[PDB]
Design a protein around this nucleic acid. Sequence first.
DNA 1: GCACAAAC
DNA 2: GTTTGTGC
Length: 73
Amino acid sequence: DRVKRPMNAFIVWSRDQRRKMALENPRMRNSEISKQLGYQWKMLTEAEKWPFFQEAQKLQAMHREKYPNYKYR
DNA sequence: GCACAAAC
DNA sequence: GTTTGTGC
């Protein structure tokens, strides 16, 4: 039925990227961390891309082989 | 447009 | 309260 769902390259940033916002701003009242990341996307920091994108590639290649044309159902 | 995950 | 990527 449902296929598996490894973390998405977007939530990847959450894990580590949010650690940054939590260190200097562990007291965010409203939901700003949401629009803040959006700003990082229109300007992705390469210092952060290369590190986790390397493996992020094997995530797609491996699981895509286990579900050739099997899409969401 | 719908289905799935996480943290503040 | 909410965002975003993947797939057609």
